[PDB]
Amino acid sequence: SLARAGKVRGQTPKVAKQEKKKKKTGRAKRRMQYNRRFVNVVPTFGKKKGPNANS
Amino acid sequence: QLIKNGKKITAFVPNDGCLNFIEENDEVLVAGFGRKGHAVGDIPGVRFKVVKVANVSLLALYKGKKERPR
Amino acid sequence: SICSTYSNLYNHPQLIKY
Amino acid sequence: ELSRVDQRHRASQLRKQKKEAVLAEKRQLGGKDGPPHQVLVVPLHSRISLPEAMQLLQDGTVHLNELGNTQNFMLLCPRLKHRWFFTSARPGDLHVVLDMAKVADTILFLLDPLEGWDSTGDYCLSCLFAQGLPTYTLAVQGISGLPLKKQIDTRKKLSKAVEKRFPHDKLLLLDTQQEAGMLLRQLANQKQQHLAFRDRRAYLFAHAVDFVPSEENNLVGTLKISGYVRGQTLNVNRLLHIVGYGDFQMKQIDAPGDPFPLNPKVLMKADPGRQESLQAEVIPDPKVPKGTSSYQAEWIDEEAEAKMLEKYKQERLEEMFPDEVDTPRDVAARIRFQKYRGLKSFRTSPWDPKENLPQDYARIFQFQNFTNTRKSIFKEVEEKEVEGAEVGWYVTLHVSEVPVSVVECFRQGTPLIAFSLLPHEQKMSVLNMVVRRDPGNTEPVKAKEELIFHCGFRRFRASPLFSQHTAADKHKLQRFLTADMALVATVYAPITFPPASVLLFKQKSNGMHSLIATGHLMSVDPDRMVIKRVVLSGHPFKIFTKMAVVRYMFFNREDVLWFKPVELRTKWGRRGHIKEPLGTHGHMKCSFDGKLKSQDTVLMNLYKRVFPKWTYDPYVPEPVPWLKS
RNA sequence: UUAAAUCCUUUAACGAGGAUCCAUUGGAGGGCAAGUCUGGUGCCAGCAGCCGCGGUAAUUCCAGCUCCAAUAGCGUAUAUU
RNA sequence: GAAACCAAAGUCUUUGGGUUCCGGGGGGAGUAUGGUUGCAAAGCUGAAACUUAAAGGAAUUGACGGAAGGGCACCACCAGG
């Protein structure tokens, strides 16, 4: 009774990944992190927007 | 059934579709769940989980990184 | 005559007994 | 247990038991009493020259046997007290490799130093992995013919490249004869990987083949196959199957002298008539006025490419929409879907397994209790001893009825093996085999396509059915072979006992076999129901509270009345049923548990039982060497 | 350099434009840092050390994008503190 | 002091007057076994495997009462049409 194995993994639509430019790695990534949170700061009255905050 | 002592135990195969990689009379490497002898979460009476099936890992088979012999 | 059928049970394979 | 000396005594007793079992297991193979140690050799890359490794590996005493193309030899030494039979096989050649690697005790893979393996080597290695690996030894050829600064880096890069297929295994290089002796000593003492299908039947490798024709015109004669028994005790009354040429009965077994003894004519048995198994693959027994109307009378080359792209579009419309088949507006729906019925739930709704069976099941065999019969047969194989020829004996087999061309194949270079079957194995049944798709090929495959099967020492063309691998009584038909799903192929075939490895190939073009699927054999029974589902879609175009008027699902009025007892479901999760048709066209009233969206779509599921086609034939064409495009 | 070599160090020549000489391992409800995003599934498959998520809008599943942590390292099991 | 309460249940992170017994999440279980005493009943000492995300202690409000009292209505009754 019931007991499917791998129903949804094999049943989900297969979408290939997009091709984007490579990320900076190492000290360059830490530089890009630093000048995003502490250098080009945006004035906000309550700071209600996160980094991944969408809609 | 374990080799070194002969005990019968039950191991939970973690991910979806990973059960099809295990066959009867296959050599498996098994580790615990993490609570050191305690049944973990939703599964009653199971202390263990499968790590390797036929000398390749379940994670490599799940991600399609390796093929298993038989 | 909507979802009704007769479906007689015929021509079964020969089985090897135990 | 306590009492430390008694605990150590228990440990010593367990040590002695395990040591006795291991030493008993290791005496059976490659020695004075046992059969010769068969070692097959595959060079994975095309740059590797196999004859150089073979003249490096031959030197004890060698006996250079020969064939039409292949050159395999017999090795004997009393220094290691060991007896070998070395054979060669080339990758890409599906026939030879897959036919005689299923009898070798040890496989030796050869790897070129610079790259890991060729594409043909990868294809052959995937087939060998999927068919069942014996004990394998990795070896390389061109390491010592390099500068040392390049030698160390080449070994490092090669060990990096190997790890994706063989996770952790040592590499033994062959350039000198001393290295060959070390490799021979390594192959003499190895942890043997025991393959079950070899062990539960009685297989044989043909060391010499003779033909005595009864009549030249009939092209039929007696085979004399001489070789070493390696499986179980070989019984004359059992049938014999040659892997590429079918199953048929034997006549006589005799024992000549051993041509290759480690430390240096009479017949054993002839077949009785009654006790011999009968070769029968199938069942033997098959008043009104002139003008008034009824309304008032109630008061009284590129075609294959186009088909391939059509198959691609069909597979694309099968995955993004699972089983929706359009209702034809020319034919009435109750006529085209006459044999389809509605199930309340696919798991719990009853369906008689013997309800409406085709005439093809009147030609096959069923098992009353397959597990019990398998257990009894295996118990009679292992626990019982039969008066036939034991393993390790050099015997000659007189087999009554064979075609001539098989002998011709043995003179072309193709290897010949023959295995004695289990009882009730020549009969035909419906094999259910669980298979998953190999990522090497991406060709779309429908349900009843014609595919070539390698199901455990058997090869046959067949048209399977693909189903979900569930635990319920009913299993839904899969119209296409999905890549990540593990599916069940259901097809008519001679019945064999698990465990058995299963390979699914497809004839691509120019005799090139493409590996499309692999897996193993599940329990065999024709009672495993395969259900084809057809989904009819309709559009709810007048929405009120809890009820709606739906069009385009049918087009007649009696078509709605025919499918009235079948309930409708909804892509947004609603459940309902048809109340009444209103239009003379396919307009109908449907009640639901909730209110339908304007964005919504009603749909119903119809179910029928489908049975596989009878396209079984043991003949399979010989593959050409495999190559990439 | 060294018994003789290898490696390190020193120096001839060739050797960098992003489809490259391309960095991963885990996670994104809370504990605990980072999505009420989109598609599929529908107490099923599954996730989840714990609390809990999934029975048709799933912040927790399977995937795409994005984001977070450590980083040539990151997980999991076990003993111990 | 968690509090109800307590001149002790105080002189406690400003923690040391002497000393005896005894507890370590809830079950298994005061169970099995062993020893000992008893005519017996049983008393004393006393586990493990396994199971479980809880069990409890103090107080704070009051849906719901099959708890009780009053009041109102010819969309309730009485006498009637």
* Alpha-carbon gap, residue D433 to D451, rounded angstroms: 14
Residues 6 or more apart in contact with residue D147 via CB below 8 angstroms: none
Answer whether any strand F atom is within 7 A of the Cβ of B7: no
- Residue D604: strand, helix, or coil: strand
Tell me how close the Cα of A40 comes to any Cα of chain D, in angstroms: 45
Write the DSSP assignment of D46-85 as a string of letters: TT--HHHHHHHHH--EEE----SS---EEEEETTTTEEEE
For this PDB entry, the determination method is cryo-EM
Residues pairing with D202 in the sheet: D420
Of the residues B16, B20, B59, the best mutation for testing chain A's interface (the one with the most A CB atoms within 10 Å of its CB) is B16
Which residue's entry shows tokens 């297991």? D25
CA angle, residues D13, D16, D18, in degrees to nearest 5: 110
- Under DSSP, the state recorded for D621 is P
Which positions in chain D touch B5 (Cβ < 8 Å)? none
| Residue D162 C-alpha from the chain's centroid | 27
Count of beta carbons in the 10 Å neighbourhood of residue D319? 16
| Nearest Cα to Cα of residue D314 among D325, D304, D303 | D325
Pairs across C and D, CB distance < 8 A: 59
Non-local (6+) Cβ contacts of D114 within 8 A are D142, D154, D157, D158
Is the distance between the Cβ of B64 and the closest atom of strand F smaller than 7 Å? no
Find and list the nucleotides of strand F having atoms within 7 Å of a protein beta carbon: 50-52
Identify residue D391 by its one-letter amino acid code: V
Spatial distance between the Cα atoms of D198 and D133, rounded to a whole number of angstroms:
12
Q: How far is CA D225 from the centre of its chain?
A: 27
Q: How many other C-beta atoms lie within 10 A of the C-beta of residue D132?
A: 20
Q: Which of D399, D394, D63, D389 is nearest to D256 (CA)?
A: D394
Query: Phi first, then psi: what are they for D399, rounded to 5°?
Result: -110, 130
Q: What span, in angstroms and rounded, lies between the C-alpha atoms of D442 and D481?
A: 10
D599 vs D493: CA distance, rounded Å: 48
Give the distance from CA D564 to its chain's centroid: 44
Q: Given in angstroms, what resolution was this structure solved at?
A: 3.3
The shares of helix, strand and coil residues in chain A, as percent rounded to the nearest 5, are: 30, 0, 70
Report DSSP state, residue D389: B
Q: Do D365 and C3 touch (CB under 8 A)?
A: no
**Cis preceding-peptide flag for D464 (omega within 30 of 0):** no
CA D309, D313, D314, D319 dihedral sign is: positive
Backbone angles phi and psi of D338, in degrees to 5: -65, -40
Closest of D367, D348, D364, D353 to residue D529, by C-alpha: D353
D545 in Cβ contact with D319 (< 8 Å): no
Written as one letter, the residue type at D443 is: E
Best mutation target among C1, C8, C16 (most D Cβ atoms within 10 Å) is C16
CA dihedral D25, D27, D29, D35 (to 10 degrees): -130
* Residues pairing with D61 in the sheet: D76
Are the C-beta atoms of D137 and D187 separated by less than 8 Å?
Answer: yes
Please choose, from the candidates D214, D248, D186, D200, the residue with its C-alpha nearest in 3D space to the C-alpha of residue D418: D248
Distance CA(D324)–CA(D601), nearest Å, equals 12
Taking the alpha carbons at both ends of chain A, their separation in whole angstroms is 43
The conformation of residue D603, written as its DSSP 8-state character, comes to: E
Residues in chain A within 8 Å Cβ distance of B16: 5-9
Q: Which of C7, C9, C16 sits opposite D367 (nearest CB)?
A: C16
Task: Render the burial of D353-389: b for 16+ CB within 10 Å, e for the rest.
Answer: eeebbeebbbbbbbbeebeebbeebeeebeeeebebb
- Are A10 and B17 spatial neighbours (Cβ–Cβ below 8 Å)? yes
CA distance B70 to B55: 10
Task: For tokens 């979806």, name the residue.
Answer: B16
The pair of three-digit structure tokens given for residue D515, joined into one six-digit string: 């590996």
CA distances from D169 to C15, D139, D172, D262 (A): 49, 10, 10, 31
Centre a 10 Å sphere on the Cβ of residue D9 and count the other Cβ atoms it contains: 12
Strand partners, D248: D240
> What is the distance between the alpha carbons of residues D356 and C15, in angstroms, rounded to a whole number?
18
For residue A17, CA distances in Å to A20, D317, D353 come to 9, 21, 45
Query: In chain A, after which residues is the C-to-N distance over 2.5 Å, breaking the chain?
Result: none
Query: Which letter, b or e, does each residue of D599-612 get, where b requires 16 or more Cβ atoms within 10 Å of its Cβ?
Result: ebbbebbbbbbbbb
Decide: helix, strand or coil at residue D319: helix
Four-CA torsion D152, D156, D161, D165, nearest 10 degrees: 110
Residues in chain B: 70
Asked if D532 contacts D610 with a C-beta cutoff of 8 angstroms, the reply is: yes
Of D209, D169, D211, the closest CA to residue D191 belongs to D169
Helix axes D50-58, D177-188, angle to 10 degrees: 80
D149 CA vs E10 C1’ separation (Å) = 19
Residues 6+ positions from D197 with CB-CB distance below 8 Å: D132, D456, D457, D499, D500, D501
Q: Is A touching B (3+ C-beta pairs, cut-off 8 A)? A: yes
**Strand, helix or coil at D318?**
helix
Do the beta carbons of residue D504 and residue D434 sit within 8 Å? no
Residues in contact with D577: Cβ distance below 8 Å, sequence separation at least 6, in sequence order: D567, D568, D590, D591
Backbone phi, psi, residue D298, to 5°: -65, -25
Angstrom CA distances, D542 to D104, D449, D546, D555, D588, stand at: 71, 43, 11, 17, 10
Contacts of A14 in chain D (CB under 8 A): 483-484
Structure tokens given for D115: 């790259």
CA distance B38 to B46: 8
Q: How far, in Å, is the CA of D6 from the C1' of nucleotide F36?
A: 31
Pick D436's closest partner by Cβ from B20, B23, B56. Answer: B20
A1, A5, A11 ranked by CB distance to D469: nearest: A5
Instruction: Give the closest nucleotide to A17 (alpha carbon vs C1').
Output: E64
Report how far apart, in Å, the C-alpha atoms of A50 and of each of A46, A53, A54 are: 11, 5, 9
Nearest to D473 by CA among D350, D365, D367, D355: D350
How far apart CA D135 and CA D295 sit, in angstroms, is 84
Both tokens of D226, joined, read: 């001489």
- State chain D's maximal CA–CA distance in angstroms: 115
Taking the alpha carbons of D222, D226, D231, D232 in that order, is the dihedral positive or negative? positive
CB contact under 8 A, D130 and B70: yes
Cβ distance D484 to B17 less than 8 Å, yes or no, reads yes
- Give the Cα separation of D483 and A12 in Å (integer): 11
Whole-angstrom Cα distance, residue D389 to residue D404?
A: 27
**Contact in structure between D464 and D402 (CB atoms under 8 Å):** no
> Is D486 in contact with B55 (Cβ distance < 8 A)?
no
A47 in contact with nucleic chain E (CB within 7 A): no
Could you give phi then psi for residue D65, rounded to 5 degrees? -75, 165
- D181-CA/F5-C1' distance, Å: 93
- Judge contact between D423 and D485, C-beta under 8 A: no
Counted residue by residue, chain A has a size of 55
Q: Give the Cα separation of D121 and D127 in Å (integer).
A: 10
* CB-based contact D502:D480 (threshold 8 Å): no
In sequence order, what are the residues at sequence separation of 6 or more whose Cβ sits closer than 8 angstroms to the Cβ of residue D165? Answer: B66, B67, D116, D125, D129
d(CA D167, CA D160): 10
Q: What are D307-315's contacts with CB under 8 Å, separation 24+?
A: D311/D444, D311/D446, D312/D444, D314/D444, D314/D446, D315/D444, D315/D480
- Asked if D154 and D466 touch (Cβ cutoff 8 Å), the reply is no
State, as a whole number of angstroms, the distance between the CA of D155 and the C1' of E11: 29
Return the amino acid letter for D466: F
Cα separations in angstroms, D239 against D232, D252, D270, D281, D419: 14, 12, 14, 12, 9
Q: What gap in Å lies between CA D146 and CA D154, rounded to an integer?
A: 9
Neighbours of D252 (CB within 10 A): 17
The enclosing H or E element of B49 equals strand B48-53
Point out the residue among B20, B66, B70 whose CB comes nearest to the CB of D486: B20
Both tokens of D559, joined, read 């078509």
Instruction: Please check whether strand E approaches the CB of B2 to within 7 Å.
Output: no
Q: Write the CA distances from D207 to D1, D21, D550, integer angstroms.
A: 55, 31, 74
Q: How many CB atoms lie within 10 A of CB A15?
A: 6
Task: Tell me the residues of chain D between 416 and 455 that have a Cβ less than 8 Å away from chain A.
Answer: none
Asked if D361 lies within 8 A of C5 by C-beta distance, the reply is no
Q: Which of B23, B27, B67 to mutate to test the interface with D (most CBs of D within 10 A)?
A: B67
Taking a C-beta distance cutoff of 8 angstroms, is the pair D469, D434 a contact? yes
